């Protein structure tokens, strides 16, 4: 059930995705409709296992910010 999404930022540099760290995982909390995130089928409750090929379990906010807000982003999803 593991999938990969390969996302492209929109014209304003955004993806339309809200991620939440909750005990033992990073999860999708909100996907804006008609966004790059919604176009690759991300949904509430999806678990993000990898970001740009790195396992992201237990990442701090700083680490996520560095990786995600330092125009292709990849994520491994369960």
């Amino acid at each position: 059930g593991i999938r990969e999404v390969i996302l492209c930022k929109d014209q304003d540099g955004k993806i339309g995705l809200r991620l939440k760290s909750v005990d033992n995982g990073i999860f999708v909390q909100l996907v804006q409709a008609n966004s790059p995130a919604s176009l690759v089928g991300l949904r509430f409750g999806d678990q993000v296992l990898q970001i740009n090929g790195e396992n992201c379990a237990g990442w701090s906010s700083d680490k996520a910010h560095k990786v995600l807000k330092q125009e292709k982003i990849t994520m491994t999803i369960r």
Binding site: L17, R18, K20, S21, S61, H65, L68
Partner: peptide, 7 residues
């Protein structure tokens, strides 16, 4: 129990 980030 932890952070939120919008991307």
């Amino acid at each position: 129990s932890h952070w939120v980030x919008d991307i």
